[PDB]
Amino acid sequence: GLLTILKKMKQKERELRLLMLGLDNAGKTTILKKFNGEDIDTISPTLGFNIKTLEHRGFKLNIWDVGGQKSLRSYWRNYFESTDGLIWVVDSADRQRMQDCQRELQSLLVEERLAGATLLIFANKQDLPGALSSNAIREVLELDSIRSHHWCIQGCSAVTGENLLPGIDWLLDDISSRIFTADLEHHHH
Amino acid sequence: AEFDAVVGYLEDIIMDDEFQLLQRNFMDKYYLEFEDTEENKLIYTPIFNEYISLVEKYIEEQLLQRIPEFNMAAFTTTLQHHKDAGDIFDMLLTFTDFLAFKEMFLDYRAEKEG
Ligand SMILES: Nc1nc2c(ncn2[C@@H]2O[C@H](COP(=O)(O)OP(=O)(O)OP(=O)(O)O)[C@@H](O)[C@H]2O)c(=O)[nH]1
Ligand SMILES: [Mg+2]
């Protein structure tokens, strides 16, 4: 209605909303905690959701981190609306759940409210020797067969904060390009 | 237009205090589901969406007590387009900010405790 229409016909150019999802124990909350450079020890599995509003390259990034515990996944959709970028986090060492991680990601991509989102995949926990390579994870999840969304896979280690920023920088640029593209076709036709 | 008139009533409806009572009576039903922690509960969301629907609906009702032929969509469409904004829309935006909504709720809870 009036209230929600008002909100988007009013968001400022450089406010972006990012939804971070993934299986429980993937390291979602560790990752955004590291972004601010908040300490990340004493982190507990999320039963609800965390909101952390950022600042990066002139952008205010409002990041929503939703618990990935299985009994919670049906509520993920209450957070789909107004997502400029979807961040899918993966525990690279969690080899036995790669299929479910795959199933979960796939159902998100046919979701209508997520039609526009840029997809960033964080193959987290690369610091673990049992961690599958990004390529192996790209193979599983069958990312190469996604043409509905722009995506990229970034191997990282939230615990050390290694490679998180390059992931985010790719995501912001892709989001910017999409908006740029839309504006282009709007003013011309 | 008939527009500038509605913009006037909004200020009158929300900055009235039947509205503030509406808000309190809503919070009375849920205030103790709200915890003072940084992590939010999933249940805050449906309550939040219920709140938004309630405010939006109290509006349209009060607005047609004014102009009995007020069509929300017509005003919204005409707004969601070519009369594009102000000073009270800023308070209107307030209702959709989840973080402030939560704080509104938290201050209320502490108040109710005592
Ligand atoms: N070795 C290693 N452990 C990590 C890494 N990132 C996170 N962890 C740990 O993995 C465990 C789970 O991390 P979380 O951030 O709670 O994962 P989550 O997806 O937010 O969990 P949910 O809230 O259930 O969704 C914690 O003990 C983290 O410290 C990493 O990069 N390497
Ligand atoms: Mg978490």
Whose CA is closest to atom 11 on ligand 1?
A25
Pocket of ligand 1, beta carbon within 6 A:
A 22, 24-30, 43, 45-46, 67-69, 89, 124-125, 127-128, 157-159
Quote the CA–CA distance of B16 and A103 in Å, as a whole number: 51
User: How open is the CA angle A120-A18-A132, to the nearest 5 degrees?
Assistant: 30
B9 and A CB contact within 8 Å: no
Chain position carrying tokens 């016909």? A9
Domains of chain A: 1-189 (3.40.50.300)
User: What single string gives the DSSP state of each residue in B56-85?
Assistant: HHHHHHHHHHHSTT--HHHHHHHHSSS---
Q: Which amino acid is at A33?
A: K
CA neighbor of A88 nearest in space, from A130, A157, A27, A165: A27
Task: Tell me phi and psi for residue A49, to 5 degrees.
Answer: -155, 150
Is A69 designated active site?
yes
Q: Classify A163 in phi/psi space as left (phi over 0), alpha (psi -120 to 50) or beta.
A: left
Take residue A49 and report the two structure tokens written for it.
Answer: 């959701």
Q: Which of residues 31-90 of A touch B (CB under 8 A)?
A: 46-51, 53, 67, 72, 75, 78-79
Quote the CA–CA distance of A34 and A161 in Å, as a whole number: 6
Take residue B60 and report the two structure tokens written for it.
Answer: 């349209």
Q: Which residues is A157 bridged to in the sheet?
A: A162
Take residue A143 and report the two structure tokens written for it.
Answer: 């990312």
Neighbours of ion ligand 2 (CB under 5 A): A 29, 46
Chain position carrying tokens 């939006």? B56
Chain position carrying tokens 């904004």? B85
Burial (CB < 10 A; 0-12, 13-18, 19+), residue A92, is: buried
**SS3 letters across A50-116:** EEEECCECCEEEEEEEECCCHHHHHHHHHHCCCCCEEEEEEECCCHHHHHHHHHHHHHHHCCHHHCC
Take residue A122 and report the two structure tokens written for it.
Answer: 């964080």
Neighbouring residues of A147: CB distance < 8 A, sequence distance ≥ 6 = none
CA neighbor of B72 nearest in space, from A56, A143, A3, A189: A3
Domain B1-114 classification at class level:
mainly alpha
Quote the CA–CA distance of B47 and B39 in Å, as a whole number: 16
CA neighbor of A51 nearest in space, from A71, A35, A65: A65
Q: Which amino acid is at B98?
A: F
Helix %, strand %, coil % for chain B, to 5?
70, 0, 30
Q: Which residues of B touch A50 (CB under 8 A)?
A: 38-40
Cβ atoms of residues A46 and A29 within 8 Å: yes
Quote the CA–CA distance of A47 and A64 in Å, as a whole number: 13
Neighbouring residues of A128: CB distance < 8 A, sequence distance ≥ 6 = A92, A93
Chain position carrying tokens 């102000």? B86
**Resolution as reported, in Å:** 2.2
Cβ atoms of residues A149 and A119 within 8 Å: yes
Q: How many CA atoms lie within 13 A of A39 on its CB side?
A: 2
CB pair distance less than 8 Å for A2 and B76: yes
Q: Are strands A49-53 and A60-66 parallel, antiparallel or unpaired?
A: antiparallel
Take residue A108 and report the two structure tokens written for it.
Answer: 């998100």
Cβ atoms of residues B63 and B13 within 8 Å: yes
Quote the CA–CA distance of A96 and A89 in Å, as a whole number: 16
CB pair distance less than 8 Å for B84 and A9: yes
Domain ranges of chain B: 1-114
Collapse the DSSP code of B97 into the 3-class scheme (helix H, G, I; strand E, B; otherwise coil) and give the result.
coil
Side by side, the strands of the sheet bearing A151-155 are A49-53, A60-66, A15-21, A85-91, A118-124, A151-155
Q: Which amino acid is at A83?
A: T
How many inter-chain contacts (A to B, CB under 8 Å) are there?
65
Q: Which helix (H) or strand (E) holds A29?
A: helix A28-36
CB pair distance less than 8 Å for B39 and A79: no
Distances (CA, A) of A165 to A35, A40, A170, B18: 8, 17, 9, 48
Quote the CA–CA distance of B69 and B49 in Å, as a whole number: 27
Quote the CA–CA distance of B100 and B50 in Å, as a whole number: 16
Quote the CA–CA distance of A6 and A1 in Å, as a whole number: 8
Cβ atoms of residues A88 and A134 within 8 Å: no
CB pair distance less than 8 Å for A4 and B40: no
B89 and A CB contact within 8 Å: yes
End-to-end C-alpha distance for chain B, whole angstroms:
49
